[model samples]
Every structure is written in C-alpha cells, then in structure tokens.
Target: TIVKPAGPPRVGQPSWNPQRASSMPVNRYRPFAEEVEPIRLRNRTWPDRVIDRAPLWCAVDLRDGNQALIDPMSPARKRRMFDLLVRMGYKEIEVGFPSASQTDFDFVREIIEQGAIPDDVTIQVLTQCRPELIERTFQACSGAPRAIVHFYNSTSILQRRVVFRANRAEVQAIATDGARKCVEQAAKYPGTQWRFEYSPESYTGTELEYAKQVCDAVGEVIAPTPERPIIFNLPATVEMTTPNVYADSIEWMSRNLANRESVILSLHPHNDRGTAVAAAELGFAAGADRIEGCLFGNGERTGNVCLVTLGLNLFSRGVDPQIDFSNIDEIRRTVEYCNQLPVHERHPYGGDLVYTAFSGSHQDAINKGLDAMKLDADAADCDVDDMLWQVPYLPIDPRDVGRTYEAVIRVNKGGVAYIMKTDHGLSLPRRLQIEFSQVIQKVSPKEMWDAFAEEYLAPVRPLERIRQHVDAADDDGGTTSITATVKINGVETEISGSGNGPLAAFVHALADVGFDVAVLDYYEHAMSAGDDAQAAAYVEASVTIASTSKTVWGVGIAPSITTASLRAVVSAVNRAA
Candidate 1:
C-alpha cells in the first residue's frame, strides 16, 4: 500500500468553494501566452541570479489599496494608514491619486502643506497620462518639500485595441506628452525635488518590444541623468501571465531601455494567481530596482503583492529589508483597520496562526528543538535569543516579531499546558495535561482558569475539604499522619490516615472515605515568591468507577504546601467521582 493508517480516515467532499465550478466553460479561456505572446528570452539570467540587496519599497496602501475597498478608508483611516507607513520606515510612500477625488487631493495637500512629509522620505502621487490630470496632481503636491509625479497610460496592445481603441503612436504620445507636462509643472514648483515615474499599465499583457519602445520614448522626453533618475514603474495591471513570463518582460525592458543607467525600474504585481510575492522577488532579480505594493497586499481585485511578506522574505535571506516589521502585529492591525480587511490566520509573518503549531507531531518536534536550544543556552550561560534558532517547524523566532513565547506554541494539549505555565504559572504533568486539556475544547484565557478552579481546586460535590492537621514524627523511619475533616456527598466525616509523607497520608485518608486513589503523579510549585507566596499542587490519581479504572487530574492552591497537598487529595477524589 502506498499509504498506511492505523485508523480509517474520512475524506469528505469540499463545500466552501464555488459549487458551479464544474459548469464553467474551462475550454473558453486561454493561458496568458496564447492570446498575448510571451516574451521569449533565450538566455534567461534571473533564474540563476540572487537577490543580494533590498529594493526601494514604495507603499501604495493609501492610494491603490484604499481604492480596492467596497467602503473606502475615511479621512481618519487614511491618516492612520499614512502614519503607520511612515513610522515603519518607508522612505517613498505613494500617498494618493490626488486627481481622482477631493479626499485624495485634500490628503495630499494636507500632508505636504502641513509639513507631514519627512526630510528623508519622498511622497509619490499617481495620476493618469493627461495634461489636465497632471496639472491637478501637481496642484495637490505644490508646496511639498519632495515628491514623485507617478504618471501612467495604458500601453498594452489588448488595452489599446479594446479599452481606448488607440494606435501604438497615440498611446506613446500620451506617455511622452505626460512626461513633458511633468517637466513643465516641475519648473512651476521649484521648492519640491521632483522625480517623474511612468508606468506602462498592463505591462505583462503588452508586447515586450512595444513595452520597451514606449518606456524609451518617455525616457527621452524626461531626459533623466543617472543621479536624477526617472522611475519606469511597470505594473502587472492584471496578472495575466506566470511570474516567469513577467520576469522575462521586466528583464527585457531592463536591458533594452534607452538610458538604462538613468531609469529606476519598479515592479507592481497583483495577486490574481496568488503568486505576487514570488513575482515580486523574481522580478527584482531580473533587475527591477524598486518594489511597489500595499501593506499585506490590500488592493484592487485579488490585491497588490504583500509588502510585509516580501520585506520579511528579504530579511529571512539576510538582506536588510530596509523596512521595520519587528512590531508586525501593530502594522497588521493598522492595515486591517484602514483596508477593512481581516488578515488570514495563516497569513505569512503577520498572521495569528503563522507561528502556532497544530499537529501533534509538529508540537513534539518544536518542543524537542526548543529543549535542545534551551539546554545548550543555559549550559553555556547564554541568552536564548543569542543562541542560533534551529527549531524544526518554526522558521524564525516568535520574539523577533514581537510575539511573546506564550503565543509561540501549538493548538494541542501541549500548547494548553504552556498557556498555564506562562499565564497561570501552573505546569501540569504530561498525563494531567492530556487529561485536563480535554475538557477545555472550550473558554477564554481567564474563563478557562476559572473553569479549572471550579472543577478541581474547589468542587462543591463528592469531596470538599474543611480543615487538615498534618503530624510527622522521626526516629528511625518517619511516620507522617494526616487527620482531615471533609464532606463526602454532603455528609461530614472525620478521616485519619498514616503514611510516609503528607501527600501519601492524604491518599490513604481518601481511601478511608471509600474513594481509593493511587497517586500516579504529583507536582507542586510556588507562585509569586515573596513573604506571601501561594503554593499550588497538581495531582493525577487512578480511581475505579463502574468496575473500570480511570485516571483524573486535580488542582489545589493555598497559602501553605501541606495544606495545598491535603486539598489536592480531596480535589483528586472529587474529580474521580
């Protein structure tokens, strides 16, 4: 057999996805290369090359991302997103398409006019390749200290044929004319350091050579020197091709541009095929100098490439991603608040479940790896973060991304115990953890604690402790006796049992009440060590019920160790009943 299992696994039909997928005409659609011929690069260099440096990251969340929402961000939300982006160390942020709406225009004017743009940062504003729109866009950022005029026109053959029905030269004129107008406007505003960015929208769908021709025309019009480079932003307006095809087109444009040294080739990828992250990296390797996207990929259609995923991916490769995502959750919250988008639990780096293990096998492997690191770190007298991370499933330390160790473990029983250890200071034995964690397939962090307290620490039924007197005498072999008063089934009873120690004697005392218990394991620790520390005890005991032996866990917390142990016996008996 190719697959082996101890138990039969139930595999069921899926219900969540589109149910009419079978009815759709699969043959009607063609792959990207059929309708639009792909760039056939015979000698592809991106596959062998490596990304060694961080690209200039431009966050377009306020403009491109906000446009994607059904209910677009409010002025307050836009300000929130803008503040978050600037705070996270993005030097070049695309603030808005100022000419699109009054809100966008005001946001641009407010930030620039109110001196919100940082000295090191250069704000970018997007606009259509029209003379009037360029004029309005320049009006928005008129008093800015520094900014980029990002102007674009639809240049793809398909877009020209269908969307506008314009010839190649007409679209080329739209781009070159926009560049000339930008130069005219830049001369009008001498206070702002102006950089012009031109995107051939739907770049992947455009013929590779045609894409190069349009960029060359715009570059000649702009006439950028190497020091004052123009940004040639190439967008996969609709992600029509495999990322490899996208990389080829980007490489061809990089190699064939009129003034290669004077152009900053930028990549703007979408997640239609769910490969925007891969596309962004490979496209950069293909010689794109700048990367543009929204935080967590919030944009139109399937959304822009996730800049968080891309930045962290760069950091993972030892390249300084140049942006700080150390407090990734705060960034995620801000993105979600502004975009009205909930980040998936499994979303890379910034997700809730990304660092959490679920499988029992995964839990064991993580624990094993952690134990070795912890042991070696302590034995060598070093900080845990200082030691090399070599965990099996966890790629990076949770602490590195502001995740507390309490939030780092699993979804299983082991994780439950870690929760108690970290949050409650009650570490259970393996058997007790396996037993106690079963009941809480349910509850909040505090509600779960209250539940354990009610079930085991102070059960009102079968057995309840009133008081206890522990007497121990030593000569040759010591005798420890426990005399306790407890309520068994609401009936008061005085019990006495003698044995080796307080807990052992309490076990015998439990037997006196017709509740025989075998102490399989017992553990105790003190919480908040000081003059007034609290002792907590955990016990797992076997008791016979309905002619079958079963083990149950119990908990006890008190002011003294002996009192805690005595109550632990009663708690164990109650759980057994």
Candidate 2:
C-alpha cells in the first residue's frame, strides 16, 4: 500500500522541499525595533473619511524627478516639460533647485524673462536653509510674477546624530531661520508675489513630537495668512516604515501645528516601500491639503508618488481629479521622451496593457459584458453612455480617456468563440464553434476567422432573385421603418415594416412575403477594417412550416450595412425555402 503524504495534499500551497528549506537560515532576520509606539487617536475620524474631493496637486517633475534621471533633461527638454505641465492644468509646479545647478537657474530665468510663465501659474524653486542659497533662489525668482520659495532641512534622528550632530533645538532653529530668510528675501523682490513653503525632510523617520515642534516654529516665523498661505511640506524622504506610520505622523502634526487654518499641509511621499500612492491618499484623508509628486512617479530611488495614477484613481471613483488626463497616451509619450525612461507596461491607467485582457476567463467575461451593453443600448434606444457601465475587469471606460476597444481583448483559442460571436456577429453552430476553436488554436483568431469566412462560409451564394432597394426612415418613437421594393424571381413586390435597427427592419420586411420568419440571432461587421471597408452581415432565422420550426443561417456582403442586411434577409428566405 502507498503511504499518504505528510501534510494535506499541498495543492495550491508552497511545496515542501526538505534539502532547500534546511540549507537556508530562517532566523537570520528580525522585525525592525524602534522606541515609538503606534499612534492611537482618541476619536480617529480619518478611518471614516472618504476622499470625495481632489487635493491641490503640485507637480515636482522638474526638481525631484529630473534630479533622479540618469541624464537630466537639458534646458530645452526642461522647457518642453514645463510647457506640458502648464498645458495639463497644473497651477503650481516646483520648477527646479536654482541653488543646486546652473542649468536649473538658467531655466528659471529663461521662463521668467521670456514671459513663458502663465499669470495663473506659480513657479517654485527649492533651496537649503543657508542664506547664500536663499539669496540665489531669490535671484532666480526676481522677474517672476509669483513663486514659492521652498526651503527644507533634515530633522530625522539618524541625520541629527550622523550628518549634523545637532540637538533638537538646533534642528528647530534651522527650520525657523530658513522661514525667516524666505520672508526677508521675498521683501527684497518687491515686484514678485512670493509664497513660502518649508519641509522637515525625512519626516517619517523624525519623532512626532519634534516634527510638530519644528514645523510650529517655522509657522510662527512665516506668519502665514489665509490670503498667502504657507506650505508645511512633510516629506517621507527615505520612507523608513509603512504608509500607515506616515499617515499617523501627518495627522499628529496637523493636530499640533500652530496657525493650522493658515498653513497648507502638503505631502511629498517617496516610493521606498512602493506604497507612495497609498501613503499620499491616506495623508489626504488625514487632513493634508496638498500633494507633491511626479507624473508616472519618476524620482530618486523607487521614485516619487505617481500623480497620474493618484489623479485617475480619484477620477474612476467619480471625483474629478482637477488635472485633465483625457489624452493620457500623449502625456505618457511626452513624459517618456523627457525622462528617457519607458513606463512599466503594467503601470496603472497609462500603460499599454492596463486595458488589455489576456486571460481566457477575463476575455469571456469582458465580451459578455460588451454584448449586454449593446443589448441595453438597443433596448433603451439611446447612446451606450446613457447606461451605467459595469463591465468585468475594467474599472473606467476606455473611451473616457481616449482609448479604443481594439486591444481590450487579446484573442486566443479559448476566446475565439466570443470574438466570432461578438466582433463579427457569427453565432456559429455548436459543432462549428468547436471546429473553429480547434483551428484557431493553430493560428491567430482573427486570421483564422477571416480564412473561415472566405473558404468555408463563402460557399453560400446570395439570392440575386431579390434585388431590393430599401427606403429607411426613423419614427418619433426612435425605431426605424423600412419599405423594400424587391424583384423576386422576375416578379416585383413591395414590403414595409418597422424595427429597432436596420437588421430588424429587414426581418420585419420578410414577414410581408409568403413566409413568416423570426430572427433568432444575428451579427454584422466590416469585411475589412477602417473607413471604405465592405460590410458583411450574418442572419440566423427560424422558419416555421406545418407547425414545425427550423433555424437557418445566411450571409451577405455589400458596401453598406443596411443593403448587406437586407440581402442577408433574402438569402435566409431562399435557404428556408
């Protein structure tokens, strides 16, 4: 007798490999240990908070994302990117770190002097807490209409000990001094409308208590008002822990910060744990008013949070993500060209394959959903958009963002039946569907279907005995009425009736003849793709005679679908006779 396996059959579970498992040291790693306890808000309201509105989106593609590029964009490339960002409806953009590079300083000066900056838009420049850099940042902004003087200082404990060797007071003093210097520099640039933003970098790794203390000190120095609000940008510089930890820090700071009403709490989440998107959303729910990220998440290390993904995520849920992504493909191309990096094929919303369905089950479900949508459209006698879309595997309608259905279902043998039925309207006999599926397994579905239409189904000849001219008109009830003049076997006959569509009108016209036929199912498509292609029609009609009914199939081809469908009706009538 065979002995039973040690554990329950191990189906859908990790297999047990004795030698490989024993060769590795399982206890080599341990969980991260830190003194900070997980925050527990007394009345945690954020859990129930729904993101019904979009945050003030601030794009940092130039400063943060450009620095991360292997070959940073040239002046011309950066200008192109800047123009793209402005056109896409970003009111605020962090243009560059003027103090860090001459290229950035030149770009800042170029846009300002050339009158390329829109009056409604505000350009931002980043600088350190030092006075010399602050002066350089102000010099770059001298001719600008409006700008944000962004200053940041690292306040994490690790940075304090190793990088600066500073105490808590020293770190807080750095932030306050930077805030005062920005205010003084703005006074010097009297013509420019200057806004101030400060960041306590590595915010997630800093103590919640110290983070609040430093930000409050900066707020006191900035003296923000509702008219010209100061931005307290908290950055997850290294993303030391999980997203929820970052959310806790944001909420804590928002609660404890001074002059909260006048301060705009902004989030600059880095994608260290690949949860930057989630972190930004959670931070918003936790009462942050603004977000700073790059398009497609191009930044240092794992990159910044993807603003496109975040914005579209809100769009899919019926909230308008202020920026327009109606031309997402164009945006992707521009971003790829500027960054010199190809976006991941599986990237959310903007990727080449995000809307594609490859699995057999997914294709089947999608095809069925599309069929249902068509039926609903016919039933309602209205546009497809009038109905709510609940298609499986697709979140947002592809058409909503300028995408077409050509690549929605990638055809394979298992999905060919649906394709033949839906795309071409060929409801083949059960045996033929199976036969065609086997054929498709050996070749591409579309190519095989085209061949079968020409070689196998093309043998059925059209009934030239019925040369019909159809007069089609629409009724107030939204249905169409067709009057057909037909010469049947050298005899002329006229038939008139109404239907929901052209094919249905032809079916109605058939009832006027000696035979009474009911349309069981039918489909039609272009014989070739694109404009000026010939139309192909399929009809499955049930003919009743002597109290018995039988189904017959007929095909028709013409330049016009209406003519082709009428021809198909005559073909079916001849077949039944």
Candidate 3:
C-alpha cells in the first residue's frame, strides 16, 4: 500500500535518505573544505565594503578563448575578433601567446604590421616562463606603439609537487628569473612604451604566503613605479573553492603584498564552479583593480569569467564600465562565429531569452509597468528614457542594450514560442481578447502575423457567401427587402426577409437558417485614409443553435462597408456553429 500527504506541502518540509543508491564511488573524493583549511582573515573588511567604482576590464577572448577552441581561429577570424573588441571600447586586449603558436605570431604581426590597432588601445601577448620565450614574445610585439608582455609560470601545489619537481624556493626562482628576462628583453626595444604583466598561474591553489612572496620578488626585479605599475594578475587558473574564500584570499594578498602603490592587482577567474563572475565582483570590493575574462565566458574547461556579465553588472549599478555594448547581439554573433561555440540561450546580458518573458503573470506585470511609465513620463512632460525603469523581472531596459520592447513580452505556454507579429494596432475588448487567444494559438501565431485572418476571416470555412441583393426602402414606404445565398455549415440554401432597413433584413434572413444572432455590439472603421481604402468591420453577437449558444466575434474587411458588415454577421454565426 502507498501513502501520501493529504494536502499542500509545508514550506520547510524534509524527507530524504542519508545515502543514495548509485554505482559511482562516493569515497573517491573529499570536499575542499576538509582538504583545505578555512580562511581566517582576522581584520577582514571585504564583506563590509561595496564596489563603488568600475574596475579596469581587459578582454582575454582572442587569446584565452581562442586557445580553448578545438579548432583555433584563422587569420581573418582572429582579425575579426580583434576588431569587435576594439569597437566595443576595450582599451586593453590580450592578442595572443606569440611564443607558443606560429599562427598566433603571424596574427599578432598582421595586426601590428598593417597598423590595425587604434592609437588609444594597447595590445598584450603572453609568454612562457622560459628566457627564450620572453625574447620571442618581444619579437612578436615589435612594432606596436604600446604593448604589454604578459608572462606566467605554474605555481599551484599540485603542479609543484608532481608536475614540476620543485619546492617553494625553486618556484620563486622561476618567477623572478622570468621577470628579469622580461626586463632585459623590454630594455632591448626602447620607445615602445612597454608594460609588464606576471601571473603566478593557479594562484588560488598555491599557499597565499608563498604566492605573495613570489609576486614581491617579481615586482623587485621589474622595479615598477606607481604610474607605471607592474600588473600582478592572480589567476584562479582552476576554480577549487567557494567565491567568499576566493575573496578572502584576494584581500589577504591585497593587504600583504609589498609596494602596493607600485602594483596593479588583477583577477583571472575561471568558471569551473560557475562562480567566476561572483568571485570577480567580490574581488573588486576586496581592492583588486582589473578583471581579465572572455566575452561570454568562453575559455578552457568551464571557461573564464564573462567580461560582458561584469560590464553589465557595473552598468546596472549606475557605474560606467567604460565598455560599450549598445549592440550586444551584434557582438555576441561575431564571437559565436569566431569561437564556433554557441553562447547559451540563458547567458547573462547577451542571451537570446534573457529579457523575454513567457509567464502570464510576468507578462502582465511587465505590461502594467510599461504602461504606467508612459503615464508618469507624460505627467512630468519628459521622455521615458529620463525615468528610471522599474519593469517587473527586467533589471535594465532592453533598449539600453539594443533590444526592443516589441518582442520582450511574448505569449507562450510550456516556456516556448514567440509571437511573430509587429505592433497590430489591436485594442481587443477583454472577452474578445480571450476568445481570439484560443484561435490565435491553434493557428500558430509564430507562423505569420495573419493568424487572425486565417482563423476568424477565412473565405469559405464554416460559412461561405455566394451572392446578396438588397432593395432600399422607397420614400412612400418604410420597409426594405434582401435576398442572400449562403452555405451554412457546408449546406447551400436560399433565404430572404423584409424589415425597416437592409441591415435588419439580413438579420431576418439569418433566422430562416435556424440562427438567432443577437448583435450585442458592432463597430466599423476604415483600414486606411484614402478613398480607395478598404473598411474593416467587427460583430460582437451571441450566436445560438438548438440548445447550444456561445458569444462570439467576427471580423471582415472589404472595399464596401455594406458588404463588410454583412460578412461580419455571417462570420459571427460561423464561429458559433
């Protein structure tokens, strides 16, 4: 026998097993909390602080996102990616790792040799920790007016213990050695306005004290000033813990790093835990000054922190992120083409469905909010753009990011389908709206804007008009007569009647076919302003048959108002029968 609860579930109801029936080995892994000690920052202030300003954002899409792709970009694709980044207002862009790939070197030289880079922008290239690679890295960046030579070496515990047979001291030596090589190589080329960036790759997994000491050694080798600071990019090369702990780790480095005024702290968070964006935001509050990520988080493994999310985050909070994404979809499409990877439909800020509402309750609230905004703007005599958008479920106005209100609110079910119509100039009464909604769904609104035409104004379905003749009332008489041949429910018949007017005569003719249509309301309007324009007619009537009745609507469009009115009444009966 099976037993279940009799009513609604409680808010905090609990019922589950301590163990699951599964084939996988659960003991093979230990939680990071058990393996690593919790961070204990005694005077932690990041939790209390809020990010009041935007950080310096550097896009790593061309370099980091490209390397992660299974099929790397061609020369043209790389150039297209660079052009997109520059157009989107990215001042600093990581072009490639010239020392690693010959194609990357060619692409880097292509942009520099052709004078493609803007004067205000700076190009960055990555190099290995070796001395020879540092020279090659400089070779690739030869002609740029300004360049940043980004260099790195693996420093995490697992890499040190197993990958490289080195202790903390030897790892420190490798970093300083790379920094010295960079300084020598940079000195060989003068007037290039060169800058240096060093990343202790996998900074999150390395001990904070050891990481800090290595960064200090590199800073000493570079001898950077406050204005020309050395960029110390700490990367969560592989995300391994909670974002709050990442924040604590960043602040600990921020507090203890030597010559803080001469260093630009930066973050390169990977999204293995799906928290790269969150961690970056917390990092800003923790006093970090720069963010490095891809356009839509495209990178190796789970991907890098999304620069678009970070930028829009700043925009949403009234801060100028210094990046322009007014045409976000255009940028997203270019990245999609270059990467050959589709950005998820629900990706933050740039997703296809991010701003679309499908729920009835959600659509209703958004509609009401938009309508009210118009009234408020009118009362103040200002444009809607001047007012703050408070539409429910919409964080920022879609127009701000190049989307329009036209398709933002869609009528859907099971969370699919978008209405295909442009604005229809439709002002349907409540009952008519509900009545037509059923027909609209059945006929498929997404197929065409003419769903209304196919469903309600079909030429010959359910009812078909053959011919009609009306005789006007003479001056001495007060009555009119009409004759009409119609196919009611596919059966042709002839009917005629006389009354005070021709319209009343049509109603009298309908009663002969066993239809009692009570015209509750009727309206007519010209479809356009010209004399040649067709007129549209609407009939709101209660159509009755043998013990079966329904209040229905009908629409008609014709060159003649008289024919349009007669067609509307016939359609009203067609809908009911």
lDDT of 2 at 569: 67
* Ranking of candidates on lDDT, top first: 1, 3, 2
TM-score of each: 0.70, 0.70, 0.71
Error of 1 at 45 (Å): 1.3
Scanning candidate 1 in windows of ten residues, the lowest lDDT window is 404-413
Candidate 3 at 504: error in angstroms? Answer: 44
- Whole-model Cα lDDT of every candidate shown, in order: 0.83, 0.79, 0.83
For residues 1-577, write the lDDT of model 1, one tens digit per residue: 2433233233553655322224335689987777788568899899999999999999999888988899888989988988898999999999889898889999987887677778998999999977899999989998788889999988877889999899999888989999999999999999878999999998878887888899899888889999999999999888886889889888888888888999999999998988998889999999999999988888999999999999989887678988888898888888888888899888999887787655657767877898899899989999877888888888788778886322232332435677788887887766566556545432456766776777787676787788888898866479999888888778999999989998888888877677778888888988888888989888778875332456787788888988877777678777876
Say which candidate scores most in TM-score: 3
How displaced is residue 24 in candidate 1, in Å?
Answer: 4.3
True-vs-predicted CA distance for residue 82, candidate 2, Å: 1.2
Query: With candidate 2 superimposed using the best TM-score fit, by how many Å does residue 505's alpha carbon deviate from the native?
Result: 31
